[PDB]
Amino acid sequence: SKLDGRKLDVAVIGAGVGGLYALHRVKNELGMNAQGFDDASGVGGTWYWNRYPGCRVDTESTVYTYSFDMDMFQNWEWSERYAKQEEVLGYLNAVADKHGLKEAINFNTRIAKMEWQEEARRWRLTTEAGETVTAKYVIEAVGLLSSSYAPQFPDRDKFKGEVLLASKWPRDEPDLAGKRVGVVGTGSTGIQIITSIADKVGHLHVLQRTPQWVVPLGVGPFPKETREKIKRDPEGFRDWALSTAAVFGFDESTVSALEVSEAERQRVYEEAWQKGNGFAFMLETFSDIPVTPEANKTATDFIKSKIDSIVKDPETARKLTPKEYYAKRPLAADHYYETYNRDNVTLHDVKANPIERFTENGVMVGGEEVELDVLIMATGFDAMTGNYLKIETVGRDGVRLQDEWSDGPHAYAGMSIANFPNLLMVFGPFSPFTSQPLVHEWQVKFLTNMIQTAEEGEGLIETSREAQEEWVRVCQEGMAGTLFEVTDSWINGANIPGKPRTSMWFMGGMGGYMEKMNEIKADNYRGFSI
Numbered sequence: 001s002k003l004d005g006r007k008l009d010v011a012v013i014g015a016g017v018g019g020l021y022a023l024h025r026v027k028n029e030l031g032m033n034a035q036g037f038d039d040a041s042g043v044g045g046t047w048y049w050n051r052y053p054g055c056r057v058d059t060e061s062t063v064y065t066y067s068f069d070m071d072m073f074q075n076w077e078w079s080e081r082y083a084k085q086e087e088v089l090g091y092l093n094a095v096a097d098k099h100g101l102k103e104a105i106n107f108n109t110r111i112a113k114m115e116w117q118e119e120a121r122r123w124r125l126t127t128e129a130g131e132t133v134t135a136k137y138v139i140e141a142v143g144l145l146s147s148s149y150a151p152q153f154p155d156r157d158k159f160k161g162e163v164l165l166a167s168k169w170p171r172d173e174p175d176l177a178g179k180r181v182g183v184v185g186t187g188s189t190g191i192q193i194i195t196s197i198a199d200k201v202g203h204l205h206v207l208q209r210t211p212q213w214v215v216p217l218g219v220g221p222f223p224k225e226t227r228e229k230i231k232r233d234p235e236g237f238r239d240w241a242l243s244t245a246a247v248f249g250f251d252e253s254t255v256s257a258l259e260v261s262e263a264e265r266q267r268v269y270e271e272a273w274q275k276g277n278g279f280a281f282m283l284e285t286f287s288d289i290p291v292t293p294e295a296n297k298t299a300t301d302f303i304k305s306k307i308d309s310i311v312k313d314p315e316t317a318r319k320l321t322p323k324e325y326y327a328k329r330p331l332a333a334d335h336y337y338e339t340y341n342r343d344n345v346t347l348h349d350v351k352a353n354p355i356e357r358f359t360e361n362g363v364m365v366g367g368e369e370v371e372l373d374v375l376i377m378a379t380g381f382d383a384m385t386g387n388y389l390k391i392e393t394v395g396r397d398g399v400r401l402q403d404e405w406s407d408g409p410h411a412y413a414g415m416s417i418a419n420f421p422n423l424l425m426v427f428g429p430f431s432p433f434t435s436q437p438l439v440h441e442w443q444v445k446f447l448t449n450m451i452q453t454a455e456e457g458e459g460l461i462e463t464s465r466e467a468q469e470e471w472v473r474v475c476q477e478g479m480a481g482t483l484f485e486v487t488d489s490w491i492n493g494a495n496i497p498g499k500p501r502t503s504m505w506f507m508g509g510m511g512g513y514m515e516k517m518n519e520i521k522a523d524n525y526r527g528f529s530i
Ligand SMILES: Cc1cc2nc3c(=O)[nH]c(=O)nc-3n(C[C@H](O)[C@H](O)[C@H](O)COP(=O)(O)OP(=O)(O)OC[C@H]3O[C@@H](n4cnc5c(N)ncnc54)[C@H](O)[C@@H]3O)c2cc1C
Pocket: 013, 014, 015, 016, 017, 018, 019, 037, 038, 039, 040, 044, 045, 046, 047, 048, 050, 055, 056, 057, 058, 059, 064, 109, 110, 111, 112, 141, 142, 143, 144, 145, 146, 189, 387, 390, 391, 426, 427, 434, 435, 436, 437
């Protein structure tokens, strides 16, 4: 192998949003000998793999975009407000084409192991094919929502049909027309598939373990007026977006739902309902919706009244009504609840009627057979830690990341890990809960500036255990003051049997994150030893 034996300054793991910019920064902007690695055959990460029907971003294309190339930031002709998967993938390919990244990426190359060599001051990487690559620094951009999860029901051998994984959709597009199709899952992926295929399949069986509080997305044209605002001052727009908590293209509300009149609550929620977008409904309306049960109930009572008015069959309306708080990743899709009024859609509550096993012709659900041609798993991810822990990662004195993270992840600022020198993450665990591209850019700029500083001397970046544990503690405390603390979902690991259930996010928003990180940088990179 020509790769075998290669010696790099920087290895970038991943060629999604994070890895592409990380590689551009170290190779093109900083002039380092750097290459990327991805098990995918091309760039795009998320947008390369998730080719399922209806896949689309929930962040407006004004903010789900790079800003580092100011020409593309102001002039890329996004076709609509919320870009579909193919368009995002096309954009990432155009970025990689323009900046010569593909020639510096080793595609179809999975990193199986990385081991710190203290005397050599290098990381030794082993690919799945057994090739050895060394790098002074590793920038790990393997994604928080990249390790697919799907239950394996008994007797799959008996089933004559197809079982598809939405997050690793087949490269040859499946034929769904006229078929009996089951969808397992009603998170963001499931609701996109459901609304995309309901009028194409012969019959759609929605296998719903837990309904969530869906609001409209507001699919529509690209906001020309925001783009005019950007062109006055694209850096100012970028900086404004980063100053918000979620970086979703709006200012979060500072008004408590409980300090206004009932008429104002109704006005605000109706306005947000017509505007669309789940993050806006949860955060642009009032300030305390995911904080107190009383405020949360004003929002869910509103959504419940919509469900009841839309869904013709009352029992179906009740099955679509969650019992949990509105305290998961907020969901949005257009014409969602109306789907259940179709004569070819059946909703199954598979908490009350569990999926028991496969049969020859379908699936057993609460004691009755549901005949299926196709079963689509929209079941999410071993989130946050899944793909980090798939790389055997050996740090100082042989310490294994698998052991360090045995009770949950521990990391400093979502970018470094104590006992793993010169290993930097893009948007790792304990990052802020934000839209990702503009925040990836900010983090990449922060960590590559640390690399450049390290390269002026010894070339060693170590992170303090105490700083890491204090960062983790701040994230735990922030979660513990919200309803996310008492609402199980992938956000706290509860969706994976056996997985530690714990806080894994910084909860102060991007504005608060940057303030903390800038204070750390100003205090001679407190918690880092460079
Ligand atoms: C359906 C879906 C919709 C989403 N919508 C939004 C949205 O609207 N707004 C938003 O902000 N975020 C959204 N996200 C989050 C999305 O993950 C991020 O926006 C972003 O795409 C993540 O980029 P990344 O580079 O961090 O990781 P990824 O996109 O996951 O890319 C990581 C790449 O590295 C590969 N890789 C992993 N391990 C290895 C290894 N050992 N060796 C070699 N290669 C490896 C992976 O296979 C992958 O190709 C969505 C995610 C999904 C799945």
